[PDB]
Design a protein around this ligand. Structure first.
Ligand SMILES: [Mn+2]
Ligand SMILES: [Mn+2]
Ligand SMILES: [Mn+2]
Ligand SMILES: [Mn+2]
Ligand SMILES: [Mn+2]
Ligand SMILES: [Mn+2]
Ligand SMILES: [Mn+2]
Ligand SMILES: [Mn+2]
Ligand SMILES: [Mn+2]
Ligand SMILES: [Mn+2]
Ligand SMILES: [Mn+2]
Ligand SMILES: [Mn+2]
Ligand SMILES: [Mn+2]
Lengths: 105, 98, 83, 94, 97, 78, 103, 99
DNA sequence: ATCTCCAAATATCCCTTGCGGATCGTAGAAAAAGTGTGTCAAACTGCGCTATCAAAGGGAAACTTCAACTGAATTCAGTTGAAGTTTCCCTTTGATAGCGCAGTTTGACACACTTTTTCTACGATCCGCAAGGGATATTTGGAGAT
DNA sequence: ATCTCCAAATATCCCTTGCGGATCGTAGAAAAAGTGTGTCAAACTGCGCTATCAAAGGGAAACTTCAACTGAATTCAGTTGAAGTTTCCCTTTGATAGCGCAGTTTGACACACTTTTTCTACGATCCGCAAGGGATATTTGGAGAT
């Protein structure tokens, strides 16, 4: 098996990640396993978001993922919501939500 | 002739705008504002249109979140009506100044 | 031609709309001017930094990236415009 | 000129997870921002850890403790195990 | 002789806002730190400054939180801080969902 | 242990904060809030300790942990 | 020393060394540590100026952590710059909300 | 000897010097010095940190006094920024004079 | 309790487009392979400092007594912001043409880096003496009562 | 508004200890020199940004009417704060026990570097078509009215 991703059993690109670590002045030297570990983490996190956005697309009778689906995904998920607590997804809008006191009585 | 009670259309406006994701501030007016402010910092600036559109996305998101906090401040004080003092309370606790 | 008073293009109807998205049911008539005040400060801060990024690059065109970088600095990372 | 992007990998991982589902261009731009962003946070923290400990080199160890510092509990558990598992497999070859 | 309810509390504010001494007793705080560390990792020691660091950080944090809490109280035309005040402060801070 | 953070002590902190009147329920809340604050910072501090292959939590470890939570502390090795 | 050539108290060599060891970039230009040393000096000058006065105002000849806290929080810009920093043993600015005071 | 008791390194002397420059008859407690040392380190990192990014952002290999200047403009509020830029520019003007 | 009606939701048609799946021809980057070299894991060592111990008093925390004053509940009316209508401003949309300037290219080189010898700034360590601490007294600034 | 009464502010004096200056020794900065490549100035260019015009109509502004919200006013049960008494444990002081942090030396090896071989991923372009998204019509759920 030629490519380092293929070796590591990954879709995400180990060689690109190695290069981006070297050319980003994080340290003088980058160990062999670091971009393997890092490509794996990145692949994993994108699988989690795609999964959860994927479902959001289906609940809204939709076949193609748009930013609203990512936003619904992220903010309906306690952990992704925390991880992207200081982030704004362009064209995501907000969660449907109305405080109780404002409901008609 | 027919009339909805006060608050009914307001609630339905909330549902409508909570479902959608389109920018709520008019596009050219917002662009003029950005250019006016830029100009006061440096003259002869040009803007990529996506640069303006980014600012709008940022601004609408900030303002929308600030109204959520403002509302919580209004409700904290047994009101249903947002008031300047609600925004000011929100911004103070957020650590925003000026 | 001179740019003046453009904060007024941020209309009452448009502020009402943002407040709805934010779940606000009733709005005091004093909210519109407070909001303008606040939006202006918000945009001064971000634009000041974006323009600095532009100047550093010796450019005359503010890019999406200058804004994306300015926002990241203010702890307000934006997704959808590069970076 | 060439504009690098994670688009192809995100498509792949998307086919794995939801095989009959597409992604809009803007949605991808967001995914791309997300991957670059998390990358930055992790490499960043990893950089510090090496400095704090007088080290010249970033290893999968710094990535690992960087991951534990940055990700909320469960997301950190799985990422850590996906990470370790890939390095384990990676050393197993050559 | 009786000072009215509030007169001493006012005096106390003046006293504590004028000093910079720590206000939690040292040992009880130290015990709490080790208990909590114990739940993350067993068989651990602490530099004495490390504990100190945590106390400084912790009190500054709480004092500032009390400032914010007090404002929410006053926002509700009240003078007495209640859990709902802390909860609101912490939420607007973005410390809580 | 958590009750070592006593009612009079909490009052004292509340006073530095400008607080004149305290509901009786505040003391239990503060303890809860303080637990979560210490948990988070110590969680991070200990991660640094472990990474350094030490058994001793340093001031630096704490300072770094405090910097990560966006709570930079001066006076201990910044 | 480069500091003397630049009329600075702060070490231009050390700042230079520290910029090479911090992995900020592949190379460091010659002017950069001067400029940085300068800015660092100006800012510490600035604090000490205001801290000193707070020591004076408190009838003291030695600056303590509390004077640094007073200097910083009574100064709008320094307060902004250290918005997310806590000065150990600094306490708070004496501040009591109006409505809490008796009529 | 032979076993040397490490070696810490701080700004304490240069701070002490600047303290003399502006408050000749005023001193500083060791704890307060620790605070100033932190402050210098903190600012240093925030500045060099931006400058590093500016260099990356612009596909450049060197941190120049140009990145320090704009890093300072991004980091420091109104009046501090303006003064810091004067002091910095001036030192470079002066340092390049001296040969 | 029952009917009226309005606007959001459902349905039909037509059609534009932006997406996934191609196939393509191809710069640029990853991998492969050889080699030079410094980082850091290991193993052994010293001793700084963390834990701990034992005891004894002094002050803090806890508990108790009391009632002042604060939050919570209720009531009501003037104020005010929501809903709906009308007029028409100015945003949006779409195509146009001109050019300011962002981004790519190419040689000459200044300027950073690397290595080695020389010189010295600044860390470690030391302790006299005064700024500050701590104790007791006298002045002052205000609260609570009459 | 005036007269008794605490507690904090101020004054005074004697002890305590960390400021801050001084001594001494080295690691790190400066000086001098040879090498090369990132940076810079200058030439050329076409993307896309500003600028305009012009027609269409969606949305803003200004208005009237009035439902209902805010907040003013009033009451009071009870939760707090202030002061007293009681019970408990934090802090301080003198070490001795030895963990594990941090210093020192080293050589195997892992990663940097650079060159040649291999192929991944990007930019350009066309296609089937389900997915939308807009223009036009209808049915539907429920708010408000009789
Ligand atoms: Mn202007
Ligand atoms: Mn002076
Ligand atoms: Mn098409
Ligand atoms: Mn396509
Ligand atoms: Mn009650
Ligand atoms: Mn004295
Ligand atoms: Mn004293
Ligand atoms: Mn007198
Ligand atoms: Mn008086
Ligand atoms: Mn000293
Ligand atoms: Mn209309
Ligand atoms: Mn041992
Ligand atoms: Mn019906």
């Amino acid at each position: 098996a030629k490519t380092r991703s293929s070796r590591a059993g990954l879709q995400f690109p180990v060689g690109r990640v190695h290069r981006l670590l070297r050319k980003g002045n994080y340290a003088e030297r980058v160990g062999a396993g670091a971009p393997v570990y890092l490509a794996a983490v990145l692949e994993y996190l994108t699988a989690e978001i795609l999964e959860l956005a994927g479902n959001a697309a289906r609940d809204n009778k939709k076949t193609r993922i748009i930013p609203r689906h990512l936003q619904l995904a992220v903010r309906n998920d306690e952990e992704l919501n925390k991880l992207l607590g200081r982030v704004t997804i362009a064209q995501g809008g907000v969660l449907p939500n109305i405080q109780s006191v404002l409901l008609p009585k | 002739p027919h009339r909805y009670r006060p608050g009914t259309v307001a609630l339905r406006e909330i549902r409508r705008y909570q479902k959608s994701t389109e920018l709520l501030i008019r596009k050219l007016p917002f662009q003029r504002l950005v250019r006016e402010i830029a100009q006061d910092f440096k003259t002869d600036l040009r803007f990529q249109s996506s640069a303006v559109m980014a600012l709008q996305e940022a601004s609408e998101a900030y303002l929308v979140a600030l109204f959520e906090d403002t509302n919580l401040c209004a409700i904290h004080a047994k009101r249903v009506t947002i008031m300047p003092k609600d925004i000011q309370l929100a911004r103070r606790i957020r650590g925003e100044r000026a | 031609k001179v740019l003046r008073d453009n904060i007024q293009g941020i209309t009452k109807p448009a502020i009402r709309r943002l407040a709805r998205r934010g779940g606000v049911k009733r709005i005091s008539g004093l909210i519109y001017e407070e909001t303008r005040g606040v939006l202006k400060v918000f945009l001064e801060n971000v634009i000041r930094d974006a323009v600095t990024y532009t100047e550093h690059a010796k450019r005359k065109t503010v890019t999406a990236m200058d804004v994306v970088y300015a926002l990241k600095r203010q702890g307000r990372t934006l997704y959808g415009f590069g970076g | 000129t060439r504009k690098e992007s994670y688009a192809i990998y995100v498509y792949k991982v998307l086919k794995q997870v939801h095989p009959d589902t597409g992604i809009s261009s803007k949605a991808m731009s967001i995914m791309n921002s997300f991957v670059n962003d998390v990358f930055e946070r992790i490499a960043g923290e990893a950089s510090r850890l090496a400095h704090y400990n007088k080290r010249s080199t970033i290893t999968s160890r710094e990535i690992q403790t960087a991951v534990r510092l940055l990700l909320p509990g469960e997301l950190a558990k799985h990422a850590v195990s996906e990470g370790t598992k890939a390095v384990t497999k990676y050393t197993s070859a050559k």
